[PDB]
Nucleic acid binder design. Structure first.
Ligand SMILES: Nc1ncnc2c1ncn2[C@@H]1O[C@H](COP(=O)(O)OP(=O)(O)O)[C@@H](O)[C@H]1O
Lengths: 97, 109, 442, 85, 96, 96, 80, 109, 96
DNA sequence: CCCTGGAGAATCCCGGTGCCGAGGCCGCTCAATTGGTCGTAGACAGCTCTAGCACCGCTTAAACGCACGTACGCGCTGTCCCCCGCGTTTTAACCGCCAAGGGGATTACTCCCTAGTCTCCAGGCACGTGTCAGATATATACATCCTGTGCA
DNA sequence: CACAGGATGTATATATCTGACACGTGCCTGGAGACTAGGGAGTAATCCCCTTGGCGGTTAAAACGCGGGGGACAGCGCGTACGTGCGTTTAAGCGGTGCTAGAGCTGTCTACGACCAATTGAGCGGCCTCGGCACCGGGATTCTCCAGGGC
């Protein structure tokens, strides 16, 4: 009785919404904590400007988006609709990573 | 007497700093000597590229019903044009987003 | 107005509040904005309700009046408004976005109220709406909240179009004269618009007397046995000495050297690696490795065989956790009041500690937790594990037990260590406290 | 003696956040094993970039990493970024 | 008085007003345009430097800049930019 | 009439050609193709033998790498046969 | 001059695919491979001709080819 | 007079030309000035890389039962090492061929 | 006569005789090794040039070379190369 | 039956051929040695401001956990046609040789362009400042998706 | 299986508010005008080499046809993992304290290390010569693949 959308309409709606927007889809404080933790391995007593974290977040989001696009292309190649670790690995292998 | 100072940009009809370009070429360690016409040529090329990208960005901004240009408009203009996309294929624009593109298999039918 | 008014209900006023009302009426007659420093426990809210009721009734000016209070006192203030002066019309702004919109549309925008009571956060949220009303009176409770300029609340409250202004703070002076100047600039922007023995003191008193009213909690009660203080020095343990030397030099990343020396004087286990290995045992390692804990371990049993009911105030919840471990080891009775304790849990713990007959013996409080409430009468002994930069914070901590409900003298044992950051912290606090005394107490 | 740990910082990159990134990428259905792979690839990418940026900062004899250092590291890796310098 | 930093923002604004008379540009977009100009300048200058080194010459000239432009820009942009640079060089030489 | 199953001879050829190192395209047809392509950019172009050899080396390396990626795509699609769709997918993921 | 691309023969394409490591080849892949080779060669020859014309020469050199491949991102070792 | 000539290559215990590297750095338009230790350091790095590659190629050639090194041996050595492969990941070696690698799904059942 | 041509062939041969005493080389392999040495030299020198420009200094020093090596070479190669360069510079400083 | 036999391909072991790598000489140019200078960079000093550590209080959006059902991935099966292996005929690559001439490579001379200096001064940059474009909220109006219902 | 209607999401005018963008002003420092000196590059001439055109004979490789089995692709069924919506929880985000140093940024001073110049002698490039390693061919093994007990 309660209204319910078919499984896949909300996915397309969200695709359109996030392809219309421009903001960052990763939380700032978790990303900053991750950046600090990674930096602690390479060198201690390191300080980060706020602009550096923003640049890292922008670059990381762009890289992940491009990866997901190529992954979706590979999944469509395999006559599927879902993306898989196989698709991610194939995309990275062809790109040379 | 001392003739009035006329800028090399005005001599070549350019809106770009021919003198600054000459200084950057001389200070950038590209060669020992720099020609007279090379900075003028380079300034003209930079001017044309800026004009092209700005024309496309202004078209996009008017298409979105706004007066100011934003990085979203810049990314929209850089994509959707083949030559600029090839020129800036490995460049990430901050606060630019992506293009609208949904695969025809995913579309419901 | 030498006598209590008639608009007050549910009991009559007394001399100190009637004199405060006279002072505020004179302030309004002279058209000056001022500060009430009556100290907690004298009826500042009662006096403010009396002033608002007076201005509503005796003067024919029912206008838009706003009272800014902390969120923790909104219900108490509304209950007092309904109780003492039910004549007035009072409306409160709190809740979610939809509740705020509903309240403003139903009651605020139509404009059938007299006093609006809102919290600081609701003022920041609804500044655009609140800026419309032709504000007449603006009573700000806990005026030391705005003691710092460059702050968003301070600038927002300055930008209102107001006629009469009032401040209700128990500690007008906290560290230096800049914050007092900021409060006085909010009161009278033109008079003080820059920067605040014969060259000083006398001039300060003659300037501030027409603007400040303060009466200590000593001319009304003639009770509450006087505060007793013992400043106990503590020898540094050997591991504490080793870590102190190591941090004095400079793998553990240490950014704030002062903030490392501070806990290092508290307990070495607060670092990483100072604690023994994986066995995770809890048997006499804590006591011996900390000199303050050795002193406290000696001190507690004597008080327990005596009056007991000790309060321990600390500036670090990690130190509070270490004290919880110690209390479990000694099988004492403990209650933890922290900044992470939910509101319902706080009241139940406070009531349980303040029962007529309880087995509780230790109550542990963060030095800045709760705030201007918290009734702890059964206590007799207050232990200040750490000393803070602002001595008024410790004064509030030690008057949380030194209130009208107490019957035995409070013994404030303050732990300090030789040749550490504690020495300079206590020296700074003493300088600030002496400045506060010389400036305000006269 | 009382201490506890919350979570690993790689888990701060949440499943809904990865879902939003895939939505911008143009993905309809997503497996459940994707999140581990995405965390791994992001960690590798960040490690490389941060190592190069730290090399630049150490060369400049500073203790603070700057947006210009990040831009230089990205340009070295072939991912030129416009907007921060 | 802060130190002086040089950006192409003024000239980008002049070009923008010439192309679209009534439009604006935000600070981030101007930063992006400045970065784009710097990147293109560096590409062309480096290519011209390598051309001079390959031909065993010590001077960067308009010929080297033209060849670098044709090597970097993709096609229609290349020919239009070459025409623009030739026009500017002719005007500069014939004027003063 | 001895006859091999359909696929063993292909594997033998795979092994031998992966062990060998010589060029796999005919030199004269490749040279004619190179000259014909250069006919569009400029007339009367003379080529050193080394230039055509280097072009052939680069072309064969590029095609071998492309075929490796195409085979990976085909195996991902659960096929043993490579297809133009596989080549197009490889080009799109490479960035061409 | 025409039909020179058909000089690139099906057996040659099959040999290249075998070195790549493929087993079964679809029949439509030969024309596609020819087009790919054509575009790659056109780009490389365009850059080489640009270098040769800058040098004011009429002969394309192995160094011109190497420089073109290097600027395209395909450094070649063995020719200078 | 003057003492006997002593090359900086021998003064640093190397086998690569320090003076030639210094001249190449000076005439390459890399900076305005060049320090004294830079040629020595760069020559040492180049010698290390060359020795590493040559050792790997010699091992490969011995596994092929040949004395001389050829481009096939160089390619085998480069592609069999992860770090050298990453260094030369965008480089084509003439007459090198490819590594023998057949996918497992194509093997006979 | 024909102008002189420089190459690293004799030094590569000396290194080869040092590492494998009884192994020879061919002309094609020598060409490949010369190209490899030139390529690595160009990469390191360009990185050091960019570092000097980024820090706004006019001199390329051993610090610049070390930073460039750490940037370009991966991992263990970088560590061993840094150690070798440090050793060579120490020997040069002491024995000069 | 899986194991046997036949057949082809791959590998290993010897013997004659050629050309290419390694060595040995000569000239010349480039690197080493001294001497002299100055400008870059190291070192220091003063200033200001953002970053950092340990907390409190509060709001609220976003993450998290749960249960349902439904498309979707995955395996299985059958069809057929396309790709492959092999033999035969044909075409053109390959090799060697010869001949001619355009054009690449070198050299010498001269001049014209550019580096470097010093005045001179106007364009560009930092600092304030006020008004308009865009962001937000809100109540309509429109488009879209989903389900039920006569069709059955 | 094709509409009607409902419920939801989304685009649309419209009013408000704010903070950043575009503008104006003062100053200063780097670019333009005038000038000289020197050496890099243009221009002409010459030489020889290396590219192109053509011809003949061999022979490996390409093109073509054929016969057949294995792979691609469509269809079908299932049980299962993921999307969708909902109710609870948590931590992000914002606003405040309270310090000190700390690290980056600018202005001066001075010394040592890199450039520049002249001179000179070994190191390196190019030219010849010669033997041994690679190569090519030949012949006896060993491994592997495909019928056939459907050996
Ligand atoms: N009307 C009154 N007369 C006397 N004492 C009072 C009154 N109201 C409260 N108190 C005492 O003062 C203490 C706190 O008073 P406070 O909350 O400061 O009053 P107000 O809220 O009116 O300022 C309480 O412990 C209470 O015992």
């Amino acid at each position: 009785k309660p209204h319910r959308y078919r499984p896949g309409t909300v996915a397309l709606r969200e695709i359109r919404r996030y392809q219309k927007s421009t903001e960052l889809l990763i939380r700032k404080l978790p990303f900053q904590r991750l950046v600090r933790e990674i930096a602690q391995d390479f060198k201690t007593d390191l300080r980060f400007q706020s602009s550096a974290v923003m640049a890292l977040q922008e670059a990381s989001e762009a890289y992940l988006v491009g990866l997901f696009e190529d992954t979706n292309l590979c999944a469509i190649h395999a006559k599927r609709v879902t993306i898989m670790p196989k698709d991610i690995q194939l995309a990275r292998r062809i790109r040379g990573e | 007497t001392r003739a009035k100072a006329k800028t090399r940009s005005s001599r070549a009809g350019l809106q770009f700093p021919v003198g600054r370009v000459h200084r950057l070429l001389r200070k950038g360690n590209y060669a020992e000597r720099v020609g007279a016409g090379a900075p003028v040529y380079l300034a003209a090329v930079l001017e044309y590229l800026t004009a092209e990208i700005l024309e496309l960005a202004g078209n996009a901004a008017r298409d979105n019903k706004k007066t100011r240009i934003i990085p979203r408009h810049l990314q929209l203009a850089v994509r959707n044009d083949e030559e600029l996309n090839k020129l800036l294929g490995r460049v990430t624009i901050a606060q630019g987003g992506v293009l609208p593109n949904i695969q025809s298999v995913l579309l419901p039918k | 107005f030498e006598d209590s008014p008639s608009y007050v209900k549910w009991g009559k006023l007394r001399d100190y509040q009637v004199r405060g009302l006279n002072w505020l009426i004179s302030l309004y007659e002279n058209g000056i904005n001022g500060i009430l420093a009556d100290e907690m426990g004298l009826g500042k809210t009662l006096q403010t309700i009396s002033l608002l009721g007076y201005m509503k009734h005796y003067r024919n000016i029912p206008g838009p009046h706003m009272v800014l209070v902390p969120k923790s006192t909104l219900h108490n203030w509304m209950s007092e408004f309904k109780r003492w002066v039910p004549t007035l019309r009072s409306v409160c702004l709190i809740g979610d976005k939809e509740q705020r919109a509903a309240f403003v549309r139903d009651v605020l925008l139509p404009g059938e109220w007299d006093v609006c009571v809102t919290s600081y956060e609701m003022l920041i949220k609804e500044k655009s709406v609140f800026k419309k009303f032709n504000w007449r009176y603006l009573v700000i409770d806990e005026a030391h909240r705005i003691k710092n300029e460059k702050s968003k609340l301070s600038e927002i409250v300055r930008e209102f179009k107001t006629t009469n202004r009032l401040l209700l703070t128990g500690t007008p002076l906290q560290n230096n004269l800049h914050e007092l100047w900021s409060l006085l600039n909010f009161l009278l922007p033109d008079v003080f618009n820059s920067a605040d023995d014969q060259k000083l003191v006398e001039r300060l008193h003659m300037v501030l007397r027409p603007f400040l009213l303060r009466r200590i909690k000593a001319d009304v009660e003639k009770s509450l046995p006087p505060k007793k203080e013992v400043k106990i020095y503590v020898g540094l343990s050997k591991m504490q000495r080793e870590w102190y030397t190591r941090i004095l030099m400079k793998k553990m990343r240490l950014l704030n050297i002062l903030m490392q020396l501070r806990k290092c004087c508290n307990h070495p286990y607060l670092f990483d690696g100072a604690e023994p290995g994986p066995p995770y045992t809890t048997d006499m390692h804590l006591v011996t490795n900390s000199g303050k804990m050795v002193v406290l371990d000696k001190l507690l049993p004597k008080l327990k065989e005596q009056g007991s009911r000790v309060l321990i105030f600390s500036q670090m919840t990690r130190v509070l956790d270490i004290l919880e471990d110690y209390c479990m080891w000694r099988n004492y009775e403990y209650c933890r009041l922290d900044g992470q304790t939910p509101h319902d849990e706080r009241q139940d713990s406070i009531n349980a500690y303040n029962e007529p007959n309880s087995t509780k013996f230790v109550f542990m409080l963060s030095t800045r937790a709760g705030g201007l409430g918290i009734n702890l009468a059964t206590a007799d002994v207050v232990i200040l594990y750490d000393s803070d930069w602002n001595p008024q914070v410790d004064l509030q901590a030690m008057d949380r037990a030194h209130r009208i409900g107490q019957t035995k003298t409070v013994r404030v044992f303050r732990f300090i260590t030789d040749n550490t950051v504690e020495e300079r912290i206590v020296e700074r606090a003493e300088m600030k406290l002496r400045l506060d005394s010389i400036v305000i107490q006269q | 003696r009382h201490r506890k740990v919350l979570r690993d910082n790689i888990q701060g990159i949440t499943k809904p956040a990865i879902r939003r990134l895939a939505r911008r990428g143009g993905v309809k259905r997503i497996s459940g094993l994707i999140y581990e792979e995405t965390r791994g690839v992001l960690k590798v990418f960040l490690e490389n970039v941060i190592r190069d940026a730290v090399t630049y900062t150490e060369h400049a004899k500073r203790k603070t990493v700057t947006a210009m250092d990040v831009v230089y590291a990205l340009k070295r890796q072939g991912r030129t970024l416009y907007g921060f310098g | 008085r802060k130190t002086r930093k040089e950006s192409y923002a003024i000239y980008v604004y002049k070009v923008l007003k010439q192309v679209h008379p009534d439009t604006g540009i935000s600070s981030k977009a101007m930063s992006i345009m400045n970065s784009f100009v710097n990147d293109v300048f560096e590409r062309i200058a480096g290519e011209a430097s390598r051309l001079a080194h390959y031909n065993k010459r010590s001077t960067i000239t308009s010929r080297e800049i033209q060849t670098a432009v044709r090597l970097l820009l993709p096609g229609e942009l290349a020919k239009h930019a070459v025409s623009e640079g030739t026009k500017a060089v002719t005007k500069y030489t014939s004027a003063k």
